[PDB]
Nucleic acid binder design. Structure first.
Ligand SMILES: [Mg+2]
Ligand SMILES: [Mg+2]
Ligand SMILES: [Mg+2]
Ligand SMILES: [Mg+2]
Ligand SMILES: [Mg+2]
Ligand SMILES: [Mg+2]
Lengths: 677, 676
DNA sequence: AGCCGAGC
DNA sequence: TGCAGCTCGGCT
DNA sequence: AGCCGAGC
DNA sequence: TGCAGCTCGGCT
């Protein structure tokens, strides 16, 4: 009676209410599948209503948020529930329009979270209903077609699982999962889970209690929530971000690509199994370059990707904005290192690696940030050039210098107040005895938000505060801040006595006591200092420069051997020592073997990293026998031989220094061109 | 005076006060244009400029119903913001004191659809307040975020005012927007198309409404027909043609998301419109329920809609996949691509002016379109009957008449006369209390029939009494089955009258507007489908002639190419020629002196408007081995035979080969569809 | 009270 | 993630 | 009173 | 085509 998306049961509200089931689905697409499966007979005792994703965690949400939540209220009216009302006896159960709620979500982790949020909602307001068997779920395999829907519902018994309340263990499990006062308990809860899962990874491998649902099904979401929200220390990426970079590297676009088009390409090439809107969000976040976002954006923002006016919220639609790799991206993630990574497999398709190994700790450059379950991560930005200098110091066996947070193009100051605590201050100075000027806001204070929440209440006053200024004007650009503020002589004197930065809200505190990351083994770890992050990154990256040299010696050696055989075959051919004309394939192969020619050395070497093949010789064109091509082939062979020796003479440290120098050169050119443009 | 219930309005600071008549309301084409306008206005612009966005085309209020005008959110928002009043004259300055803005400035894209929005706004002011046009009420802002502030700083260079100069302006606006002036629009556009052909055999700040209509809006009306009226040759409109051109170039072997393909089409074919229209077109090309396509060229992999809701129940284009049908390239043979005139956007090659299918696809899937002045509507026709008529005409026989035919339609289509048909569903008496409905007429959707026919029969429906006692549904996704219960009395009287009549199971189909573009791009009205079939036949037969001339030349060039390659290989394995350690230029001159031909395929392709022996010397060293020499000799002889076998065949023979190959796969595909 | 961002 | 208005001509 | 579909 | 709710943890 007033619920647009509701397909109410025919007998709902009448005398057969307690025999009616309300099916709450995960989204409208799931609703139509349920309505399709119920046929026509299902309308008498089954209603369908869709949930628009995650619902409110009512256990500790404010009363205002609970009263104004449309989805919670819709469920209450459809079922006929009432707050504070107990459902103990059978007399109280008559005011309900439905006797059972059947949750129908995807059989993935986020579906389990929605189930738990519904369980948390009923358990917090009507615990007596759970002891009556009010909640159940409809299981599916792994959405599907209309024909499959009617086959699931025809076999309703095999897909219907009922939740069971068995004692206070169920209350404690629900509280463990959804109470804000149980964050530390969730840390221990997940710590035991991650530890136990490693033990069995080294070895092997119709009723459901709420305690078993929390501790055996919901925990898979909570852990997966951390795996997708807490970045890796090695490359500073989360898996979704890493899939984007992997796709951009594999495409190697030389011209702009629409963000929406790229998102579709990422989902296909990297097996991204979530909605594309989140993926398009990730791409926009990876491309932003305004003050307070990325110190080095790996994707270029070609279009309106947001400004410091609205903290990037003013970005245009992803169907109208373009992007492509920054020229620094491949200097930070050298393509040769791809041969050293562990690439994952989804549906037997090879996808992104478990991590990339950049030349500097990218987790410190762009400020890794993420919210999971139990833990969260928050890192500020750090200066790329200072990071390089500390890497160069550690390569010389010296201790790295301490580092303060640093944001590109930020004109203010960041001062250390204590361990992992910092004061971030904008810029304000007195012009005359009636004027101050504000030329910088602290990091992540957006211009429009500062205007509306600080300067307008200072100009007009509120119901709780007086006016402080008489006027202000704005002279901003898209990337800078300039407020000119007018005050009386008296008010300005009082503002200076109290502190201009304090009065004008131009100083904010930055506290970094939750630097939680996945280490290189995939273990969640809390890091107390950025130096600890830098050190753990340094040893791994240096070791991989060792692996890269071993790889290059083998690969360049095989290429040298290959050119030696090809050059030998051409020289022996243009002199009459060997002939192939009108010879059979069998005789030609057995002859090349008998004369000491090697099977494809590059293919052999690549297969070693896991009949004779002379195609690398006989697929050469007939041009190969002509004079200029013989001279060209001999010079290429001799040049590769010198290339092997030049590489053998370099240390892993030398290779790292070459990469760092090449990166700094392009970083200077790009950042200088940015200031020109 | 202020406005507070319109979220998307950025009202001017002085609007509503004493400076109202000096304030300008900027109406933009969409929210993105609004944000660009507020960006360009700086800070000073907020005092005398308001901005409000229009969400696309607005209501043509001329001759629109009173209910539609009263309930239109865009029209009412404009009235509330400006302060206008219906039936009020604005002659003197005393009447102008009730307006909150003195001017409206239209800001649209400088394309045809933007011109249409300008005209629709002009039509709205002209129909209700013609006195305002005589005061200079309407103006426009021309374009060719930082660029926005530069446009507004140079405001008067971009600002053009509309001018009323006499009854020619009233007549011009009425010509464009009055339902009583369709025939005048036909004449209006016929002269334009004719005048444009003549000049292609050879080579201010005020603007009157008559010049805007006859020199700017007419460009929209014409391009509206070019994108909405299909071509006779392939049955496509340009947007549909860009999609198939893109699918052909991609040649996907696996399913592709519709939204992804739409983005691929915009890039590869220079599609300059919104993605939503393009995703519409793709879904429409893929649908295969009863009443849509007889041969869908794209496969519907996912929920593309059903006959339950006429396809409006299709899932989002982000969740459904598509791919070429195996029939598409049998209908549009790739070899014929070498005969088409491909178009150019900027400097990129895009889709052709038309494809030339082996059968008139314009009849198979029912061409349909609404333009300006004209519209097109064709029913579906049977593919096999059309193949049979093509075979008859190839043998000099007369083609059989064809009735409309819809795939999987179990009903009846009867000819009442020329271009007039009775389309009937199926209903039969089960017992003396039950009828059963097993088919609805073509394009009557199941849910619509239930709500608009069966429910009024079951319930009240105003003065008419209830006629049935109950009904049950036993539909599938592709079939219809209603079982209806009645008393013996009202069933007998319903049976006494027409059962198909009483239950609304008969619809008429009239096709007196078969308007298409002919092969030259001329708009033409066809009286019968035989006229369409004949004109298609003469063109397609001629192009099978061109295919033979093209293939004989190309296969001949390939034959010459292989002859030289085989000659070089035989002379090399015998010692008659050596290349070892010879310089490039000596080897080139040596090959010339022995009669070796420069690349014959390249020469032939350049003929269709130093020596190149790369086709010989890029061959691998494998070429000199025994098995590769025998293989090269056999390939050379097979191409020679292929050229000769082709020169003996007639263009009719090639057409019959294609038709048989098409029918063979059509039988296989349609048998697999009925199994699934 | 609300940001941050990868999910629904 | 799902959802919504209009044009234009012929026809019912 | 509204469908059909390529556009905004 | 633009628009909108929520989770989860640390912190202001
Ligand atoms: Mg899911
Ligand atoms: Mg960041
Ligand atoms: Mg446009
Ligand atoms: Mg059609
Ligand atoms: Mg009409
Ligand atoms: Mg919170």
């Amino acid at each position: 009676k007033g619920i647009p998306k509701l397909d109410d049961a025919n007998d709902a509200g009448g005398k057969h209410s307690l025999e009616c089931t309300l099916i709450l689905t995960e989204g409208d697409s799931a609703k139509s599948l349920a309505v399709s499966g119920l046929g026509v007979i299902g309308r008498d005792r089954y209603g369908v209503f869709p949930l628009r994703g995650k619902i409110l965690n009512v256990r500790e949400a404010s009363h205002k948020q609970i009263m104004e939540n449309a989805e919670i209220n819709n469920i209450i009216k459809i079922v006929g529930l009432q707050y504070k009302k107990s459902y103990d006896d059978a007399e109280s159960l008559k005011t309900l329009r439905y006797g059972k709620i059947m949750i129908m979500t995807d059989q993935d982790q986020d579906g389990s979270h929605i189930k738990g949020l519904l369980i948390n909602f009923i358990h917090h307001n009507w615990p007596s209903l759970l002891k009556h068997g009010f909640l159940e779920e409809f299981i599916t395999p792994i959405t599907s077609t209309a024909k499959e829907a009617k086959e699931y519902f025809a076999d309703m018994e095999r897909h219907r699982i009922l939740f069971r309340y068995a004692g206070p263990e169920d209350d404690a499990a629900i509280t463990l999962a959804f109470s804000k006062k149980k964050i530390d308990d969730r840390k221990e809860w997940l710590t035991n889970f991650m530890e136990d899962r490693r033990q069995r990874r080294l070895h092997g491998l119709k009723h459901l209690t709420y305690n078993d649902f929390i501790n055996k099904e919901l925990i898979l979401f909570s852990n997966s929530d951390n795996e997708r929200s807490i970045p890796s220390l090695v490359d500073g990426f989360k898996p979704g971000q890493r899939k984007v970079l992997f796709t951009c590297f594999k495409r190697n676009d030389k011209r702009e690509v629409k963000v929406a088009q790229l998102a579709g390409s990422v989902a296909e090439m990297s097996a991204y199994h979530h909605g594309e809107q989140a993926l398009m969000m990730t791409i926009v976040n990876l491309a932003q370059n305004f003050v307070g976002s990325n110190n080095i954006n790996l994707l270029q923002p070609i279009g309106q990707f947001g400004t410091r006016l609205h903290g990037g919220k003013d970005a245009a639609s992803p169907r109208y904005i373009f992007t492509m790799l920054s020229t620094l991206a491949r200097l930070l993630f050298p393509a040769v290192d791809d041969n050293l990574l562990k690439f994952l497999y989804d549906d037997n398709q090879r996808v992104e690696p478990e991590w990339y190994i950049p030349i500097i700790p990218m987790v410190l450059i762009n400020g890794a940030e993420g919210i999971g379950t139990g833990w969260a991560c928050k890192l500020p930005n750090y200066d790329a050039r200072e990071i390089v200098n500390n890497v160069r110091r550690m390569l010389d066996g010296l201790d790295p210098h301490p580092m303060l947070p640093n944001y590109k193009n930020f004109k203010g100051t960041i001062q250390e107040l204590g361990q992992n605590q910092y004061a971030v201050s904008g810029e304000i100075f007195v012009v005359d005895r009636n004027t101050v000027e504000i030329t910088e806001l602290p990091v992540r204070t957006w211009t429009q938000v500062y205007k509306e929440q600080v300067l307008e209440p200072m100009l007009n006053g509120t119901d709780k505060t007086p006016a402080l200024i008489s006027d202000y004007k704005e002279y901003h650009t898209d990337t800078t801040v300039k407020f000119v503020v007018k005050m009386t002589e008296e008010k300005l004197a009082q503002a200076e006595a109290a502190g201009l930065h304090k009065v004008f809200k131009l100083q904010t505190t930055l506290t970094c006591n939750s630097m939680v990351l996945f280490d290189h083994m995939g273990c969640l770890k809390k890091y107390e200092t950025v130096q600890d992050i830098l050190k753990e990154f340094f040893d791994l990256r240096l070791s991989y420069y060792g692996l890269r040299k071993e790889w290059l010696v083998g690969m360049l050696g095989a290429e040298s051997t290959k050119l030696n055989n090809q050059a030998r075959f051409i020289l022996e051919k243009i002199q009459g020592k060997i002939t192939i004309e009108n010879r059979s394939k069998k005789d030609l192969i057995q002859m090349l073997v008998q004369r000491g020619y090697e099977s494809d050395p590059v293919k052999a070497w690549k297969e070693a990293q896991e009949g004779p093949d002379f195609n690398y010789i006989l697929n050469m064109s007939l041009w190969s026998l002509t004079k200029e091509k013989v001279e060209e082939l001999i010079k290429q062979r001799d040049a590769k031989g010198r290339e092997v020796n030049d590489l053998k003479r370099k240390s892993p440290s030398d290779l790292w220094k070459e990469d760092l120098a090449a990166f700094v050169e392009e970083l200077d050119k790009v950042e200088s061109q940015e200031r020109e443009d």
